[PDB]
């Protein structure tokens with residue numbers, strides 16, 4: 001019961017499941033309604049779950065209740081006293097950031113894009129400060145509300161090309177490997193959801209990174225933004241910025257917006273000669 005100290009217990013009579021929107025660890029995820037009704041997403045733990053699954057499920061509910069931040073997905077509450085058990089979160093019409101950007105290519109200003117990154121960074125600074133390592137930070141795990149506010153979430157695995165070398169090589173997941181992932185997310189946002197490293201295979205990505213190659217500048221990208229994402233990709237974990245540094249830089253760039261007008265050179269893959 002203590003694990004749920006920051007959570008609100010919701011009575012099952014207040015919940016209606018409507019459509020399956022995913023598969024959980026041991027159950028389905030539903031779109032539904034919560035008692036004027038509020039649309040919600042509902043992750044269930046179905047009959048037969050193991051002890052480890054229950055510990056992980058209630059632990060997830062407990063940390064989500066603990067988190068209270070503008071840029072972290074909101075937990076409405078939990079059903080733990082009845083079966084099936086449920087984790088109930090807010091629901092976003094705009095959905096996941098990766099698909100959102102790919103469906104809105106070129107529709108936002110540079111300031112809007114950088115504002116999204118500042119929000120993600122603030123949520124990640126909060127998680128890291130709370131001693132929570134995400135391990136799967138990627139645009140597909142970020143929700144976008146109708147104010148363009150980005151909320152860090154974790155929908156479980158669908159991530160070599162988002163993962164820092166030390167996490168791949170020896171399973172060292174820390175806030176600093178999350179920083180590497182954040183740099184990849186910066187590149188996803190500034191490219192409107194391009195696939196990191198395009199068609200390179202997972203092995204080719206790892207070999208390129210080990211050889212010293214890094215993702216090139218997105219088109220029309222502020223110089224300061226590319227500089228920041230590049231420093232997230234330093235091989236040496238200790239040399240990467242902390243999330244506090246990232247938030248501070250992004251905030252200062254937004255608040256002095258002329259700083260974003262200087263653009264990094266873009267390397268064309270294709271030459272078009274015209275008179």
Ligand SMILES: Cc1ccc(C(=O)Nc2cccc(C(F)(F)F)c2)cc1Nc1nc(-c2cccnc2)nc2ccccc12
Nearest residue numbers: 021022023029041042043073087089091092152153154155
């Ligand atoms: C129901 C639910 C339960 C848990 C989470 C979730 O983000 N958990 C989580 C776990 C660890 C750390 C964090 C984090 F990020 F730190 F906050 C969040 C999200 C959701 N919400 C959604 N899940 C899912 C989903 C889909 C497939 C598999 N699992 C969840 N899809 C959604 C679609 C639209 C709006 C919300 C959701």
